[PDB]
């Protein structure tokens, strides 16, 4: 667990970025401001700030009685829900660090997380993302992967029930210091990202300012709450610390979510592009009343200008583009930015002390507007992954810059434009091709729902291109789309060598497209 050198600590405290409260103290402060206001809602249950705080304290007492102590680690694998929030904040109070596993994670990942972190417990549910994790949890215990397995819901011994632990008398003490690790986030087997209370609260508080969160923010969880976008950018925690209300959802389909928005008067949410595409193309479901919606954050992957330009007309809300990473840096377009920035950039950095360097293969800083590897250090960017000295020696420069693996350029005013991952690059007979440019043209096509362009081996040109396209009916042929690209003025060498009409793309844990999976499919 590498830390910030002393010069940086001192400057981030002097700047006022790092304050002296833990997550638990911060929620308690917010609760005290508005104790009866509804803080969380699910399909039936609604908790006031004061009821949430008390339940968290009661769960904390129960977890302590069950053996969880300050400095312990747990693997937290729960669907979106009230239990996720309660359990997180109870662990924050106790100084117990949760590994924030995603709903899509399975035994390979879960086992690795328990083992690598030496978790005392796995905390899970009777069901998650269509998966029954209780067999796995039994094997975790049988193999020594963790000591204990708590299940919210029904489960057979040797698994233990989480609900009885809420019956304890409320623990009133906090064991967490602002400089301690609060939780382990996960890289997008995922690496463990040690996030500390004071820096990750800076992340939350400043994001909430930039995104205009306030007492009236009604935040819908469009993504897994474990994920950093959903949790802190500004996320669920930004909503709670602004004294807003969080509306939980275990699904992001526009059918369900549009009705929730109407029911709860949702004002804010966050999505990855593929989900935003579904919301933009939702047909009869758009009969819903979405008048309450004020801000749609889109991030995780680039939202091209063809799609971005449809957000305000179709949904009636402002768009914000978010370039983010669990390791640190967040860039945001700002709520008062002109369209040219919101449609065509992925934001500018959150903190004045975020230090960004775009560098070529040699480590040279590129010229302005030129494309290079994004690297960065700053007041909420880690200095290394948890207990990973050998990987850390490659992933961080000697002066402490995190090497993101993304290819970006910068515009005149500091805004980042993401070309994609280093591994997404296409070189077609020595001509370079920016997938995003071709993807954005195809996505503008009226019978194209989404598109993704990747590299395939070729003996003569080294690489050719293949575009995967989800049609909307009536679906165009590959030949019609090649002609449509031509009529748009796309350079000939950039027209995909191959276009695959398909109903869906493989997806990552939170819904991003897996170009790795596509590129392994081709070869
Ligand atoms: N607007 C964008 N345009 C192009 N690419 C983007 C991108 N936003 C992310 N990426 C890619 O996603 C990696 C990080 O992924 S992440 O840890 O899961 N966390 C997130 O995505 C995340 C998103 C929002 C807020 C907090 C977060 O933590 C990045 O290095 C980069 O490759």
Author numbering: 14 to 201, 206 to 540
Paper text:
Using the potent salicyl-AMS inhibitor originally designed by Ferreras et al., the structure of the stand-alone salicylate adenylation domain from Pseudomonas aeruginosa was determined to 2.11 Å. This is the first structure of an adenylation domain bound to the salicyl-AMS inhibitor and serves as an important visual model for making future modifications to continue to develop salicyl-AMS as a therapeutic drug. The co-crystal of PchD and salicyl-AMS diffracted to 2.11 Å resolution and X-ray diffraction data were collected on Stanford Synchrotron Radiation Lightsource beamline 7-1. Analysis of the salicyl-AMS-bound PchD active site revealed that Cys250 is located near to the salicylate ring of salicyl-AMS. The work presented here describes a modification to salicyl-AMS that exploits the presence of an active site cysteine residue near the salicyl ring of the inhibitor. Importantly, both structures were trapped in the catalytically relevant adenylation conformation due to the presence of the inhibitor. PchD overlays very closely with the adenylate-forming conformation of the AB3403 adenylation domain with an rmsd of 2.03 Å over 438 Cα. The Asub of PchD is comprised of a central three stranded β-sheets surrounded by three helices. Regardless of the ligand bound, the two structures are in identical conformation with an rmsd of 0.15 Å over 523 Cα.
